[PDB]
Design a protein around this ligand. Structure first.
Ligand SMILES: C=CC[C@@H]1/C=C(\C)C[C@H](C)C[C@H](OC)[C@H]2O[C@@](O)(C(=O)C(=O)N3CCCC[C@H]3C(=O)O[C@H](/C(C)=C/[C@@H]3CC[C@@H](O)[C@H](OC)C3)[C@H](C)[C@@H](O)CC1=O)[C@H](C)C[C@@H]2OC
Ligand SMILES: [Ca+2]
Ligand SMILES: [Ca+2]
Ligand SMILES: [Ca+2]
Ligand SMILES: [Fe+3]
Ligand SMILES: [Zn+2]
Lengths: 361, 116, 141
């Protein structure tokens, strides 16, 4: 009655840790604390979470549109707030204290632990700003977080002020990276306006992504479904599936790689049953022209897909896969049980109160 | 007023649910703008109910029991369907906040996994 | 006073726990026992004519409507909604649609959001803060 009916279930940690636990004496977030605290569904004081958002925004806003990421590095695809799979990812990819990381975006939406994923990743960024890097994906913007789950999540767990602060940090995320002077890394893919790498360097990126143009395409582009068949002469085609942007062909990737003297394109953005996918090999050097990474296993609790990260070194692409891990339950829209049950309580009670009333003519 | 039923894939054409039966369904629900509000498949537990008795919204009873035998498209076991349900046959002007707003039309993508 | 005499003949045509389920539709209602108990204000197992009128009278200010909704969850009538009480009453309505681990986890997070003073249960004040005071009184009519 006052004890817990299901004692094998761990209870959530506190929604109010002290400042001395969330931050190291130097004022940077204590990521080892936040890792365990978020595993147990603990929350922060709002001012603590805003502090982490503001320090990450400050670091990110100083980086260029197009990062330079040296090898060895672990490259990761989508997370989508699947915080308990993110814990496994770090196990597979290496300890951030001695492993370089490059995330390709889509940290938020769909999973019920987006703000934990985002605050945790940012606390790594802040503590390891020279070895830990994060690109923007197409979900790191106002339009999609409004349409999917992340805004409802911030409003439920924190406030709209925090939601606005996250948007500021999304607009500051870099768009792409050159990894080891060999790979173009981006969330979506190529663009008809990606004439040179300078086209990307000249963009004003601190904004919501446009309806169309370079910045939209980097976040939204896919390869054509028949990309490996290589039976199209065009470089770019209208992406009906996404309802914006373009799908690009093997010919577009090869001309781009030749122009920029690069080996391959590494991106994410599309779910993969195997966690990754290597596409048709380059006629110039033999490397895969394209690689898709996807780091969200059992996507949406229903795909039963593996996830993968890429551990790149010595000109070797070590693909490391992992399966899904269990996570706690949330109602849709982060409803509490009173919000969830009270409409039904009222229906069921009223029904009885009307039968009791209608017993007499 | 009736709900719109569009048959995506068909089942056995033999096993039709009748009022008072139970069914088992995997459904994804979304609004006409595409925003999803719920999915049984994500929750891992197929929905089970008794159809035709008012234990669900009226659109579901009408869809699953063929308007109690008075159509105007039947659904058989193994059919994957799409039910477009008008607000008066769902949650009306009140809605179920904060998950369903007012005067909302609901689109359910249902797969009838079992009957009884 | 004319309606107060009206409930006397409804009550007389109808209370024991066996008599109560006889009412049409109450037999299959998942909140049948919870509603019985709330009307059963002295916990003796049957509903008085004074409890009948008094409990109906909340369906008055909006405060009696909030008090009734609270009492559906407060099983032992102690004035707090305990973690286990919340699980038990939810289990009456949720059926096999959630696993017990799932139900306990969202029961836990609900109370941790609504529990201001830190004791792990919800008094009437914290319950009123956590719900829509208006949505509740409107439903009851
Ligand atoms: C203890 C919790 C309450 C209890 C909750 C469950 C057993 C869990 C169960 C999987 C519901 C889901 O919870 C994850 C969730 O399913 C939805 O997302 C949904 O897809 C939906 O529309 N469905 C469910 C599938 C059949 C049709 C319809 C429905 O008929 O649902 C019914 C419904 C809401 C009827 C209302 C009741 C209130 C009246 O005012 C209204 O009168 C017009 C009619 C459901 C089955 C109720 O009988 C039972 C409950 O409410 C709703 C959008 C909101 C709903 O959560 C509440
Ligand atoms: Ca009594
Ligand atoms: Ca109690
Ligand atoms: Ca309390
Ligand atoms: Fe994605
Ligand atoms: Zn994407």
């Amino acid at each position: 009655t006052v004890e817990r009916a299901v004692k094998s279930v761990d209870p959530p940690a506190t929604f109010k840790p002290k400042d001395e636990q969330v931050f190291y004496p130097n004022g940077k977030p204590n990521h080892q604390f936040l890792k365990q605290h978020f595993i147990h569904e603990g929350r922060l004081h709002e001012h603590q979470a805003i502090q982490i958002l503001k320090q990450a925004t400050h670091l990110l806003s100083k980086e260029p549109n197009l990062l330079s990421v040296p090898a060895p590095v672990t490259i990761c695809g989508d997370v989508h707030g699947q915080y308990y799979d993110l814990m496994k990812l770090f196990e597979v990819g290496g300890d951030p204290a001695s492993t370089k990381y490059l995330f390709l975006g889509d940290y938020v939406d769909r999973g019920s632990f987006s703000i934990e994923c985002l605050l945790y990743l940012y606390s790594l960024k802040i503590n390891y700003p020279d070895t830990f890097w994060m690109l923007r994906g197409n979900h790191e913007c106002r339009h999609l977080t409004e349409y999917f789950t992340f805004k409802n999540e911030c409003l439920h767990k924190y406030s709209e002020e925090l939601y606005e602060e996250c948007l500021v940090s999304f607009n500051a995320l870099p768009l792409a990276a050159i990894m080891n002077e060999q790979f173009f890394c981006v969330h979506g893919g190529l663009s008809p306006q990606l004439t040179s790498l300078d086209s990307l360097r000249k963009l004003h990126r601190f904004r919501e992504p446009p309806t169309k143009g370079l910045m939209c395409d980097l976040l939204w582009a896919d390869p054509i479904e028949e990309y490996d068949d290589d039976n199209l002469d065009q470089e770019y085609v209208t992406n009906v599936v996404r309802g914006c942007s373009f799908a690009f062909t093997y010919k577009a990737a090869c001309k781009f790689l030749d122009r920029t003297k690069l080996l391959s394109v590494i991106r994410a953005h599309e779910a993969q049953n195997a966690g990754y996918r290597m596409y048709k090999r380059t006629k110039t050097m033999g490397f895969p022209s394209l690689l898709t990474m996807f780091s969200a296993p059992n996507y949406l609790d229903s795909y039963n897909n593996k996830a993968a990260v890429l551990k790149y070194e010595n000109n070797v692409m070590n693909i490391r896969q992992f399966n899904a891990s269990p996570h706690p339950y949330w109602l849709p829209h982060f409803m509490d049980v009173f919000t969830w049950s009270l409409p039904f309580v009222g229906e069921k009670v009223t029904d009885m109160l009307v039968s009791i009333l209608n017993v007499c003519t | 007023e009736l709900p719109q039923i569009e048959i995506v894939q068909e089942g056995d054409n033999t096993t039709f649910a009748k009022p008072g039966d139970t069914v088992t369904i995997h459904y994804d629900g979304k609004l006409t703008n595409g925003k999803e509000f719920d999915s049984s498949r994500k929750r891992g537990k197929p929905f089970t109910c008794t159809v035709g008795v008012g234990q669900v919204i009226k659109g579901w009873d009408i869809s699953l029991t063929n308007n109690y035998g008075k159509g105007g498209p039947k659904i058989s076991k193994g059919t994957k369907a799409i039910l477009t349900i008008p607000p008066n046959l769902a949650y009306g002007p009140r809605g179920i906040p904060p998950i369903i707003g007012p005067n909302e039309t609901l689109v359910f993508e249902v797969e009838l996994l079992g009957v009884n | 006073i004319e309606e107060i005499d009206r409930l006397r003949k409804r009550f007389m045509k109808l209370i024991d726990k066996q008599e109560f389920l006889s009412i049409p539709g109450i037999s299959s209602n998942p909140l049948a026992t919870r509603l019985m108990d709330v009307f059963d204000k002295d916990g003796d197992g049957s509903i008085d004519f004074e409890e009948f009128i008094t409990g109906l009278s909340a369906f008055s200010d909006n405060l009696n409507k909030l008090r009734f909704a609270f009492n559906i969850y407060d099983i032992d009538r102690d004035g707090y909604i305990g973690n286990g009480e919340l699980f038990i009453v939810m289990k009456m309505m949720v059926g096999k649609n959630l696993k017990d681990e799932e139900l306990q986890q969202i029961v836990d997070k609900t109370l941790m959001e609504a529990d201001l003073d830190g004791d792990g249960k919800l008094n009437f004040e914290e319950f009123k803060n956590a719900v829509n005071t208006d949505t509740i009184a409107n439903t009851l009519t």
